[PDB]
From Swiss-Prot:
Residues of the full protein shown: 1025 to 1191 of 7096
Subcellular location(s) per record: Host endoplasmic reticulum membrane
Protein activity control: Inhibited in vitro by GRL-0617.
Name of the protein in its database record: Papain-like protease nsp3
Record text on subunit structure and interactions: May form homohexamers. Interacts with N protein.
Residues annotated as domain Macro: 1-167
Effect of residue 31 to A: In strain: Mu/B.1.621
Domain of life: Viruses
Known function: Responsible for the cleavages located at the N-terminus of the replicase polyprotein. Participates together with nsp4 in the assembly of virally-induced cytoplasmic double-membrane vesicles necessary for viral replication. Antagonizes innate immune induction of type I interferon by blocking the phosphorylation, dimerization and subsequent nuclear translocation of host IRF3. Also prevents host NF-kappa-B signaling. In addition, PL-PRO possesses a deubiquitinating/deISGylating activity and processes both 'Lys-48'- and 'Lys-63'-linked polyubiquitin chains from cellular substrates.
Species name: Severe acute respiratory syndrome coronavirus 2
Membrane topology: Multi-pass membrane protein
Length: 167
């Protein structure tokens, strides 16, 4: 049993809810929250900008030190950093950004990072400002992640479309 409430069950391991991931993280304090990161961990907008704002910029300060030491992530890659006030840990995962021309096949590689964690609160990778089809992102998630993932979808209209169209 876990603390997540109000989710619709899509599969054995994937759950979904219309929720603001920031507000959900603050309520649940999950072991892992996933950030929709870019390779520079520049948390300007979308999910990343919202998570970072909720940490009062402490996520960005920590991320800048990570990049100064390690250099940029790979598209499809990830790193584990602090969850600050939102979670124990933040898994920063880089899905491909269609608005930069990145290979959508890298979305499966991105989701494979989730398998290193038994339970996660996450957004749909490569959705929102990264420009990919969220229906596709949900299908890749279900067909890739084997650990227990609780997906937060900010937009109610999109949530209802994801559920209604789910095979
Ligand atoms: N408060 C809205 C956070 C968010 C979710 N998705 C994109 N941004």
């Amino acid at each position: 049993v876990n603390s997540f409430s109000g989710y619709l069950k899509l599969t054995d391991n994937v759950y979904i809810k219309n929720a603001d991931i920031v507000e959900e993280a603050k309520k649940v304090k999950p072991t892992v929250v996933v950030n929709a990161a870019n390779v520079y961990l520049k948390h300007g907008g979308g999910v990343a900008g919202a998570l970072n704002k909720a940490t009062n910029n402490a996520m960005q300060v920590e991320s800048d030190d990570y990049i100064a030491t390690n250099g940029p992530l790979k598209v499809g890659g990830s790193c584990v950093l602090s969850g600050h006030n939102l979670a124990k840990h933040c898994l920063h995962v880089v899905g491909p950004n269609v608005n930069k021309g990145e290979d959508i096949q890298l979305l499966k590689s991105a989701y494979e990072n989730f398998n290193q964690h038994e339970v996660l609160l996450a957004p749909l990778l490569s959705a929102g400002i990264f420009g990919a089809d969220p229906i596709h992102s949900l299908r890749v998630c279900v067909d890739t992640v084997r650990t227990n993932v609780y997906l937060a979808v900010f937009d109610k209209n999109l949530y209802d479309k994801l559920v209604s169209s789910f095979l």
